[PDB]
Amino acid sequence: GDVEKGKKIFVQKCAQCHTVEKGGKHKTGPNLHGLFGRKTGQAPGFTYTDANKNKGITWKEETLMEYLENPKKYIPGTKMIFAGIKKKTEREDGIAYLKKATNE
Ligand code: HEC
């Protein structure tokens, strides 16, 4: 698993829901910035979901592993549309890149 490969994975992955590079339009859910640093989905000019506005919790690596169970159980009311990826190895791989992306 390489960082370069991970970046590409996220791109088809879903990136449309997390908007592209800063400059376009706000995405449906926090891309990643402040994922393991900020509270939960409390971005700036970004339109947070009902859950984010409530200030859920900081999505961590380990917490994400368990959260992978019932996405609706963590943030009820939010639906996840799209996702050309599923392979547990693919998802986990992207997370590694995310670890450095937030720290590295
Ligand atoms: C569109 C229908 C989406 C797809 C496909 C993916 N995400 Fe998303 N995500 C989306 C929305 C509208 C929201 C808000 C609340 C929710 O839980 O859906 C989210 C939420 C997240 C967050 C929140 C992070 C934060 O800063 O609070 C993250 C980090 C997130 N979703 C990650 C993620 C990943 C890794 C995806 C592909 C592997 C993915 N989402 C798909 C919108 C959509």
Side-chain angles (χ1 to χ4, degrees), residues 9-10 12-18 27-35 38-43 46-52 57 59 64 67 71 75 78-85 91 95 98:
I9 274 176
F10 151 117
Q12 350 222 21
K13 234 339 193 353
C14 51
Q16 339 195 234
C17 283
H18 305 236
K27 88 228 40 131
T28 333
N31 212 5
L32 56 320
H33 232 203
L35 187 55
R38 293 195 126 51
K39 183 17 60 198
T40 59
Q42 18 54 51
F46 181 76
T47 229
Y48 3 69
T49 70
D50 152 289
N52 296 165
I57 230 330
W59 338 80
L64 255 181
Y67 148 95
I75 289 321
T78 227
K79 205 36 53 53
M80 276 281 256
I81 300 90
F82 205 88
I85 299 250
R91 288 218 230 151
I95 269 187
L98 230 168

